[PDB]
Design an enzyme around this catalytic site. Sequence first.
Site, PDB file in Angstrom:
ATOM      1  N   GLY A  58     -30.470 -25.111 -18.500  1.00  0.00           N
ATOM      2  CA  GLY A  58     -29.011 -25.302 -18.553  1.00  0.00           C
ATOM      3  C   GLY A  58     -28.354 -24.467 -19.657  1.00  0.00           C
ATOM      4  O   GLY A  58     -27.760 -23.446 -19.318  1.00  0.00           O
ATOM      5  N   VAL A  60     -29.146 -21.976 -21.414  1.00  0.00           N
ATOM      6  CA  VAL A  60     -29.365 -20.518 -21.161  1.00  0.00           C
ATOM      7  C   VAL A  60     -28.610 -19.945 -19.909  1.00  0.00           C
ATOM      8  O   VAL A  60     -28.206 -18.778 -19.969  1.00  0.00           O
ATOM      9  CB  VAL A  60     -30.898 -20.173 -21.230  1.00  0.00           C
ATOM     10  CG1 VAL A  60     -31.260 -18.710 -20.873  1.00  0.00           C
ATOM     11  CG2 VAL A  60     -31.524 -20.452 -22.621  1.00  0.00           C
ATOM     12  N   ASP A  61     -28.318 -20.718 -18.835  1.00  0.00           N
ATOM     13  CA  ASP A  61     -27.151 -20.441 -17.943  1.00  0.00           C
ATOM     14  C   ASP A  61     -25.817 -20.237 -18.734  1.00  0.00           C
ATOM     15  O   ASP A  61     -25.198 -19.187 -18.561  1.00  0.00           O
ATOM     16  CB  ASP A  61     -26.979 -21.537 -16.851  1.00  0.00           C
ATOM     17  CG  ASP A  61     -28.106 -21.642 -15.816  1.00  0.00           C
ATOM     18  OD1 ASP A  61     -28.595 -20.676 -15.236  1.00  0.00           O
ATOM     19  OD2 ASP A  61     -28.488 -22.937 -15.599  1.00  0.00           O
ATOM     20  N   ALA A  62     -25.432 -21.158 -19.655  1.00  0.00           N
ATOM     21  CA  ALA A  62     -24.340 -20.914 -20.642  1.00  0.00           C
ATOM     22  C   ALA A  62     -24.354 -19.550 -21.386  1.00  0.00           C
ATOM     23  O   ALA A  62     -23.475 -18.737 -21.104  1.00  0.00           O
ATOM     24  CB  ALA A  62     -24.169 -22.113 -21.594  1.00  0.00           C
TER      25      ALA A  62
END
Length: 79
Positions: A58, A60-62
């Site tokens: 999550g 690292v999607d950011a």
Amino acid sequence: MENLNMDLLYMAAAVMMGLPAIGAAIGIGILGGKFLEGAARQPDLIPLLRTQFFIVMGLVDAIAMIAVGLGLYVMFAVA
């Protein structure tokens, strides 16, 4: 081809830049909350390793989608 391919790459990258506000925010808030419910039951649990994996994957999607997609959004439209 020239301008139409640059409109398509732009629009997908700014759509990708806002996607972490659903995806990685549910990652930290809900899959850190569900992780700590797993640690109260058993500190080496199988749904604990699922939820902790979605804390890192999550957020690292950011970082990756916000910096690459806000970068492209500002290069094509602002310039």
